[PDB]
Amino acid sequence: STPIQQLLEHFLRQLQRKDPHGFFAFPVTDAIAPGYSMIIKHPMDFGTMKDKIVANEYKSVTEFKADFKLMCDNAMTYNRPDTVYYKLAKKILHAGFKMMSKERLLALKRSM
Incomplete structure (x- = not known):
């Protein structure tokens, strides 16, 4: 079970x-x-x-x-803006990219 696997x-x-x-x-x-x-x-x-x-x-x-x-x-292409799927896709996208930002990954790098 590789490090990358555990992280993802x-x-x-x-x-x-x-x-x-x-x-x-x-x-x-x-x-x-x-x-x-x-x-x-x-x-x-x-x-x-x-x-x-x-x-x-x-x-x-x-x-x-x-x-x-x-x-x-995909969610933001198939679904109209005013749907639950469109809104949740946006919210999760933003929170995903914050969690996995270059800047957070770098801080982790520096402490290893």
Whole structure:
């Protein structure tokens, strides 16, 4: 269980806590979101991100953040602004990028 794996697990646990209803837990289906797959070309979700951590597919924080951004951007593309999914995507995006900022990562660097 590599250091990066342990770190991303931690970030992921913190992010999933801001989604109590599990809207980002698993892939959005066409059954619950009509036409979704005709609009979103690269679906992403916490579940898929988890699997990639376990399989050791992320080489950096950068690559993990990219998948996280893809997830929020997908929500803000398919959904209209005045929806719960759009608003939660924005909120979580901002809190994710604050948690995983260059400046916080640097402070951590300096104390190791």
